[PDB]
Amino acid sequence: KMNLETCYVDFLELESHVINEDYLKESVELQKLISTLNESKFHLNKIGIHDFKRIRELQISLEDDLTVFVGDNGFGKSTILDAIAIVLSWLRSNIEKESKPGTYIKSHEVNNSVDVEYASIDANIKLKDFNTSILITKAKEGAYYSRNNELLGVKKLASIYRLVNKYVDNASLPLMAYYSIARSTVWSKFDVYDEIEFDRNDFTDFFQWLVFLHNRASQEKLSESQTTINALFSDIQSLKATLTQLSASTVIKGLELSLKEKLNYMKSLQSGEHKFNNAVSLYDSVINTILKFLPEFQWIKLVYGDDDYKIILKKGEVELDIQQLSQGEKTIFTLVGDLARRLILLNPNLSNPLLGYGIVLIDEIDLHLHPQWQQTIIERLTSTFPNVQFVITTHSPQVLSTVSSRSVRILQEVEVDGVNDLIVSHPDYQIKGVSNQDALLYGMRTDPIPSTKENGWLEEYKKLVELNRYSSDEALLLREKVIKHFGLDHPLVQECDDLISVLEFKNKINQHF
């Protein structure tokens, strides 16, 4: 019942009249704005494309939690992700600073057809009930494009975020990340950078970041913070001697001790910078996030030996090194590590920082993964961070079997009116819990069984067995070839031989009576 723009206009109206910053800080308009803003959900809604790369004209609607794109090679799977990256680049640039250019469209990315003149992209972002839209365009060579871009809507969102973050500290911001393919300030305080592109298989840099963070953590656990701890320890002992141990001027001594302890402890603890994002809380929050993602382990720690140092992980009753992990485990390790690092650094106020909002784009999630790993990645991703929007592209049929049919789109190519263009379809069945080949045959519409020459004799033999013919010499020699290639005890051969016994027994019993 509190629209975002209504509270925005009320706030900036009261802010224009009053020049007292302290009074405005406690104004109920600010509290209303913050309360309504926090409950909103940042989800993209629709994407429109025109004459971009192979794509001529298309409009796609996205889900709110998960969306999977399935297709062959050269079907525009990456084009959608690059389109969304260009859309989000301008919003991020305006967020950082007003009237800052984003990223443009390369000349070679325009369609190569004769009659093309310009290319444009349109988008729509929905926040609860507030809506916004943006359109970007470029012209091939000297033509007449659709004038210029349309950024009016995005500047309102950027102004809203700037205004909210200017008055109240430690606010929240949306997350935008894109894990691309090979191709080729709080962030500045520790080591991190503000870029939208991050690459996997960079385990060395994350390893060095982890050890450096652990070193700063340990440095911070010493020094002046020990003195406060010592005082607290004395406070516990003295109060005990005055109140607890005294009862196994006692009352006066106990009251004086408790009052002095409370006053000193409160004065010392309050003095200094708040918790915020000190290295101690970052280290343990990241470690606990990684431990939550992978419950098969017990603990992870860094050990300084007599002549070296290494990271130790305990699983079951075995201690393993970070360097004994396979490529897939390292890829998952760095992916989750970077995601957790960004989420912690973006929500310094929430009690559980894993409840932020944002959108994540992943291309070819099944890279360097064993089949047993592919069957559990989606559930963990969608359960560790339950308030984020995911857009994923994939190639393996094993991943598809764990995804509900509501959030899968299939890209095809058909020719209409003499022009070839791509189309988007949906599966005709529920593909959550089906086997491997059922998911391959339905979710992708390919052939699960290869077309090898050896299978030809099996198909011909089985067909010959249908129209009763298992007495001809041709059938005998085909059976000889089949029995030579596979063997007597191959399950397929036994199943083939079963039919013969069924027919023979059928006519036997039929003639018996």
Partner 1 sequence: MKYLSRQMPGPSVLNKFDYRRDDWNSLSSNDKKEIWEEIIKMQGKLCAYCEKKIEHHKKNKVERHIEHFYRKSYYKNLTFEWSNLFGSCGEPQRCGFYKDKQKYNDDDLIKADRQNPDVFFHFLENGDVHIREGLNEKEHKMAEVTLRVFNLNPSSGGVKAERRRAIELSMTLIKELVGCASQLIESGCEIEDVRSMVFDEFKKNVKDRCFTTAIKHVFENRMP
Residue 222: name its binding partner from ligand ATP, a second copy, partner 1, none (Cβ under 5 to 8 Å by kind).
a second copy
Distance CA 63, CA 359 (A): 12
Choices 37-45, 92-100, 212-220, 374-382 (CB under 8 A): range interacting with a second copy: 212-220
Contact pick of 27, 40, 79, 103 for ligand ATP (by CB under 6 A):
79
Q: How far is the CB of 293 from partner 1 (least distance, A)?
A: 21
Nearer to a second copy (CB atom), residue 10 or residue 235: 235
Site residues (CB under 8 A) for partner 1? 487-489, 491, 494-495, 498, 501-502, 505-506, 509, 513
Cα gap 384→415, rounded to integer Å: 43
Q: Which stretch binds ligand ATP (CB under 6 A): 39-47, 72-80, 422-430, 470-478?
A: 72-80
User: To the nearest whole angstrom, how small is the minimum distance from the Cβ of residue 108 to ligand ATP?
Assistant: 6
- CB-wise, 43 or 216, nearer to a second copy? 216
Strands of 42-52's sheet, edge to edge?
A: 55-61, 42-52, 118-127, 130-139
Q: What is the dihedral of CA 385, 386, 389, 391, to 10 degrees?
A: 70
In this chain, which stretch among 70-78, 293-301, 397-405, 456-464 interacts with ligand ATP, using CB under 6 A? 70-78
Residue 398 marked as a ligand binder: no
Q: Is 16 labelled a binding residue?
A: no
**To the nearest whole angstrom, how small is the minimum distance from the Cβ of residue 312 to partner 1?**
25
When CB distances are held under 5 to 8 angstroms depending on the partner's kind, the choice from a second copy, partner 1, ligand ATP, none that residue 506 binds is partner 1
Binder of ligand ATP out of 74, 433, 456, 487 (CB under 6 A) = 74
Q: Could you write out the three-class secondary structure of 291-307?
A: HHHCCCCCEEEEEECCC
Q: How far is the CB of 115 from ligand ATP (least distance, A)?
A: 13
Q: Is 423 in the site for ligand ATP (CB under 6 A)?
A: no
d(CA 315, CA 337): 19
Q: Which is nearer to partner 1, 182 or 509 (CB)?
A: 509
Q: How far apart are CA 134 and CA 123, in angstroms?
A: 5
Nearest to 48 by CA among 16, 77, 87: 87
74 binds, among a second copy, ligand ATP, partner 1, none (CB under 5 to 8 A by kind): ligand ATP
What x-and-dash track marks residues 244-283 binding a second copy by CB under 8 A? -x--x--x-x-x----------------------------
Nearest-CA neighbor of 31 among 212, 164, 180? Answer: 164
Of the pair 212, 429, the CB lying nearest a second copy is at 212
Q: Residue 495 binds which one of a second copy, partner 1, ligand ATP, none, with CB within 5 to 8 A depending on kind? A: partner 1
Q: Which of 73-90 are b and which e, b meaning 16 or more Cβ less than 10 Å from the residue's Cβ?
A: eebbbbbbbbbbbbbbbb
Element (H, E) at 197: strand 197-198
Residues of this chain, 104-123, that bind ligand ATP according to CB under 6 A: 108, 111-112
Contact 107, 116 (CB under 8 A): no
Q: Smaller CB distance to partner 1: residue 174 or 397? A: 397
206 is in an annotated binding site: no
User: What b/e string do you get for 46-72 counting C-beta neighbours within 10 Å, with b at 16 or more?
Assistant: ebbbbbbbebbebeeebeeebbbbbbe
- Least distance in Å: CB of 216 to a second copy? 5
Q: Point out the residue whose Cβ comes nearest to ligand ATP.
A: 74
CA 353/CA 284 separation, integer angstroms: 13
**Buried b / exposed e along 191-230 (16+ C-beta atoms within 10 A):** eeeeeeebebeebeebbebbeebbeebeeeeeeeeeeeee
Cα angle value 214/217/218 (rounded, 5°)? 90
- Minimum CB distance to a second copy smaller for 305 or for 450: 305
| Chain centroid to CA 300 | 23
CB of 76 to ligand ATP, least distance (A): 4
Comparing CB distances to a second copy, the nearer of 41 and 301 is 301
Site for a second copy in 293-312 (CB under 8 A): 304, 309
Side by side, the strands of the sheet bearing 318-321 are 299-304, 309-315, 318-321
Sign of the alpha-carbon dihedral angle for 165, 171, 174, 177: positive
Number of other residues whose CB lies within 10 A of the CB of residue 22: 6
- Interhelix angle 327-346/279-293, rounded to 10 degrees, is 130
Beta carbon of residue 46, minimum distance to a second copy (angstroms, whole number): 53
Provide the binding-site residues for ligand ATP, judged by CB under 6 A.
Answer: 53-54, 73-79, 108, 111-112
The binding site for ATP comprises 54, 74-79, 108, 110, 112, 315, 324, 326, 329
